[PDB]
RNA sequence: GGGAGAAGGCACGCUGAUAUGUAGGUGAGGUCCCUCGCGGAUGGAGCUGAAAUCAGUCGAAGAUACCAGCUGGCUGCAACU
């Protein structure tokens, strides 16, 4: 805050976080979100409110992102797919960064081609079902592709906005839009939960026992994300093996997360995947099937929890194991010729690494786990609205956590 | 040539550093050359590894056992194995 040139990168997000509110509270025209929001009302629109939460609350709006930024994770999601079954793109990857700018380029095509599909697919099959229920305008093609136009200029737009605040502003784009949108709906609850409480619909204590817990999550989560294990190891002896003296790292840290936010919206979007492909036909053989394993999975119901923590443990573990690599430490204390007491050098080092962290990412993703477990008991048993859901908390601690500690590292790099 | 191992004396263990194993010994990967091979040069990873010096430490005793010359002076005879 003190800091000017730190001043101007928050000004810039700040800035881009306004145009992206203005941009999201403009609706689509021909479409009336009024009869939107009323359907929502409903237990068929609670399947698509795990799906709005990502979206910003621009879903409800009918705004120019109907799926936010979740196809572009997506296409993400489909390129690290094709570059592990097609070796093609893997040589292309291992062909340095020349190639890595080929894969941006692909990611961003695939994309726009994504955008393109899912607006066909939405915009022509939900409202046009019945049809004419939700929307005036007739199904035509002039509908069609001035929703799909529409919703690939504002996919892009989106993605624009998204590399400006990476590039000329600190942290990623992705992370603090969607972090935004997130705890954009944070004070409307908040209002509409004391409105309410003075009606005597909702108690105090209640209110009060939720803050608490809250607030013990909090500080729960931010004192086991800085946990760490340190490996303790002294070298080296005899100073004229020009190795000795340092002047380095005497003990080897060990951080239980990362930490990113990436492996919870990969698996967010892996898990809503098939929730959002079936909530495309509300009537129909869809009403028959379709939307009763659409209510298979749902933030109120156990098995949707169970199935996303299993996800969340699966992708924070591989995504933990693929970050840190034993090979670069133990070739960077080769060099160095560090003797780990404890050891001797080689792939017997890397072993031994690999060995903690499997027992350390482990329990840190049940504790993860847990985390994420207990505000769907706490809905249910205390009412609370669905912006006190565990995956937004979540989200909000990882992107502020990971905000503040890039701040920190920034910081720390100008200093010294 | 010998006599001579003459006689007589000195250090000797362990641990650390000089060097997280040195001097040497071996010689991978790589690059180059080739009359292209079980080839040549470069190359130094790994592996092996004395000796010494300095500092410390234990014991009455460090060639701690088994192992492993008694030595010197005069003379007879036979040169010698």
């Not at 899912?118 to 939700?134: D, F, V, Y």
């Not at 209640?206 to 800085?226: I, K, M, S």
């Not at 951080?255 to 990969?266: T, Y």
Request: with cysteine; glycine share 10%.
């Amino acid at each position: 805050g003190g800091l000017g040139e730190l001043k101007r990168r928050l000004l810039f997000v700040i800035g881009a976080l306004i145009v992206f509110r203005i941009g999201s509270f403009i609706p689509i025209p021909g479409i009336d979100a009024a009869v939107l929001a009323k359907l929502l009302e409903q237990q068929r629109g609670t399947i698509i409110e795990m799906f709005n939460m990502f979206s910003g609350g621009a879903l409800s709006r009918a705004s120019i992102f109907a799926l936010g930024i979740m196809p572009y994770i997506s296409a993400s999601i489909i390129i690290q797919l094709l570059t592990v079954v097609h070796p093609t793109l893997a040589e292309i990857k291992k062909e340095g960064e020349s190639g890595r700018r080929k894969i941006s380029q692909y990611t961003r095509y695939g994309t726009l081609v994504l955008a393109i599909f899912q607006s066909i697919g939405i915009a022509t099959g939900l409202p046009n079902m019945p049809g004419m229920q939700g929307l005036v305008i007739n199904p035509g093609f002039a509908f069609y592709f001035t929703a799909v136009v529409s919703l690939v200029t504002g996919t892009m737009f989106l993605m624009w906005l998204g590399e400006q605040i990476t590039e000329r502003g600190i942290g990623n784009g992705i992370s603090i839009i969607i972090f935004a949108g997130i705890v954009a709906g944070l004070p409307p609850a908040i209002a509409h939960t004391i409105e309410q409480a003075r009606q005597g619909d909702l108690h105090f204590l209640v209110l009060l026992l939720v803050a608490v817990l809250v607030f013990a999550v909090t500080f729960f989560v931010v004192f086991v994300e800085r946990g760490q294990r340190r490996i303790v190891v002294n070298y080296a002896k005899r100073q004229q093996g020009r190795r000795v003296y340092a002047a380095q790292s005497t003990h080897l840290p060990l951080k239980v997360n990362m930490a990113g936010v990436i492996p919870a919206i990969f698996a967010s979007s892996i898990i809503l995947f098939p929730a959002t492909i079936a909530s495309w036909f509300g009537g129909g053989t869809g009403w028959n099937w379709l939307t009763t394993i659409s209510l298979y999975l749902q933030p109120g119901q156990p098995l949707y929890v169970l199935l996303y923590a299993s996800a969340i443990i699966f992708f924070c573990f591989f995504y933990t194991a693929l970050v840190f690599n034993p090979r670069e430490t133990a070739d960077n204390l080769k060099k160095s010729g560090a003797f780990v007491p404890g050891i001797r050098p080689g792939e017997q080092t890397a072993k031994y690494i690999d060995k903690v962290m499997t027992r350390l990412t482990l329990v840190g993703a049940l504790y993860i786990t847990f985390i994420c477990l207990i505000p769907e008991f706490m809905r249910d048993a205390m009412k609370v609205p669905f912006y006190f859901g565990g995956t937004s908390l979540l989200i909000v601690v990882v992107v502020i956590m990971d905000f503040m500690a890039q701040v920190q590292t920034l910081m720390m790099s100008s200093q010294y």
